[PDB]
């Protein structure tokens, strides 16, 4: 078995079915006490919660699902009828994420998309019937942040006020993406300093609000 499978089994044996908060707490306990993993975590997760509550997005896109931690965290705060789409390139992670969402009782709010973000984004309008996105959580791989942001704009998926929220802009760091959004009149940017999940290491989130072409 894999670390990801151990995390899922730990949730299934130590959380309450249908209780998202208990799922998050179980994941955080396992990753603090047993094995580190790249979930956004509780310190940065609290900032994400604040953002979700401020904007009450109807349609969120997540880039990078992993075990489903961040998907659980966002989906538990969505209003009735609101939806999350999450893209995940690794099929074993996609299956763990689906099972995690099912355990948490959130499966009707989330759709997992299999594949690479750069291949799936251009399909959102026609295949997946998306008009524009209200929020995007970028948390896949540092070198894809800038290219996928530019792709989302090209594809007409951003509207005035779409919120981009990017993890790990300090560790490992995303200097091309930060330089671009902070220098572009098409974004209004705020930095939220925090900590790397489960570690006493500084990290941060960037919020970049799209302002149109
Ligand atoms: O790749 C990631 N995607 C999403 N979120 C991540 C995340 O939240 C992380 F904290 C890390 C991280 C940071 C520091 C570290 F030491 C190990 C891993 C990674 C990551 C970075 C570099 C890699 F070589 C492998 C994984 C990711
Ligand atoms: N181009 C790409 N498209 C889609 N998923 C990708 C990708 N490159 C990397 N990934 C995926 O991005 C994930 C990064 S970790 C995601 C953590 C998650 N957001 C959480 O906080 O719980 C991995 O599962 C990895 O397989
Ligand atoms: Cl944490
Ligand atoms: Mg991350």
UniProtKB/Swiss-Prot annotation:
GO biological process: artery development; behavioral fear response; catecholamine catabolic process; catecholamine metabolic process; cellular response to cocaine; cellular response to phosphate starvation; cerebellar cortex morphogenesis; cholesterol efflux
PTM entry text: The N-terminus is blocked.
Keyword match RNA-binding: no
GO MF, any single term: magnesium ion binding
Annotated cofactor note: Binds 1 Mg(2+) ion per subunit.
Domain of life assignment: Eukaryota
Reaction catalysed by this enzyme: a catechol + S-adenosyl-L-methionine = a guaiacol + S-adenosyl-L-homocysteine + H(+); 2-hydroxyestrone + S-adenosyl-L-methionine = 2-hydroxy-3-methoxy-estrone + S-adenosyl-L-homocysteine + H(+); 4-hydroxyestrone + S-adenosyl-L-methionine = 4-methoxyestrone + S-adenosyl-L-homocysteine + H(+); 2-hydroxyestrone + S-adenosyl-L-methionine = 2-methoxyestrone + S-adenosyl-L-homocysteine + H(+)
Keyword Cell membrane on entry: yes
Binding site for substrate: 142, 168, 197
Cofactor(s) required for function per UniProt: Mg(2+)
Keywords: Catecholamine metabolism, Cell membrane, Cytoplasm, Lipid metabolism, Magnesium, Membrane, Metal-binding, Methyltransferase, Neurotransmitter degradation, Phosphoprotein, S-adenosyl-L-methionine, Signal-anchor, Transferase, Transmembrane, Transmembrane helix
Positions that bind Mg(2+): 139, 167-168
Residue sites binding S-adenosyl-L-methionine per the record: 40, 62, 70, 88-89, 115-118, 139
Purpose: Catalyzes the O-methylation, and thereby the inactivation, of catecholamine neurotransmitters and catechol hormones. Also shortens the biological half-lives of certain neuroactive drugs, like L-DOPA, alpha-methyl DOPA and isoproterenol.
Protein family according to the UniProt entry: Belongs to the class I-like SAM-binding methyltransferase superfamily. Cation-dependent O-methyltransferase family.
Protein name: Catechol O-methyltransferase
Parent sequence residues shown: 46 to 258 of 264
